[PDB]
Amino acid sequence: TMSLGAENSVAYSNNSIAIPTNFTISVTTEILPVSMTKTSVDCTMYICG
Amino acid sequence: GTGVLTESNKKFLPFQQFGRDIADTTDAVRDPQTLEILDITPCSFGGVS
Numbered sequence: 001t002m003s004l005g006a007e008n009s010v011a012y013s014n015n016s017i018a019i020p021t022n023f024t025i026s027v028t029t030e031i032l033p034v035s036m037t038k039t040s041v042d043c044t045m046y047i048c049g
Numbered sequence: 050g051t052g053v054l055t056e057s058n059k060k061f062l063p064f065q066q067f068g069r070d071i072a073d074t075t076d077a078v079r080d081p082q083t084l085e086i087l088d089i090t091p092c093s094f095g096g097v098s
């Protein structure tokens with residue numbers, strides 16, 4: 001049976017806050033399709049050669 | 050058929066008379082008189098715009 005992720009109880013209370021004391025600069029890659037090959041078929045030459 | 054005949058580097062085994070493409074079309078021939086192996090490529094074609 002598949003795991004959905006690690007389980008985590010966030011430390012919530014009516015007067016507690018967490019504040020980050022540092023940071024990390026992250027570089028992420030996203031790849032997107034933009035075009036496909038421009039095919040052409042001559043219908044008469046495909047069908048009748 | 051109709052095409053451009055040319056001498057070829059295809060090593061036909063002694064029992065083979067034709068070569069065929071993915072489309073069943075004859076891609077090469079053995080000449081019946083002098084046993085040359087000839088490629089066949091179609092005569093050049095394209096859209097006119």
Ligand SMILES: *[C@@H]1O[C@H](CO)[C@@H](O)[C@H](O)[C@H]1NC(C)=O
Pocket residue numbers: 082083
């Ligand atoms: C047939 O052609 C080949 C060469 O293409 C030749 O060797 C052979 O002698 C010919 N046979 C006859 C009966 O003409």
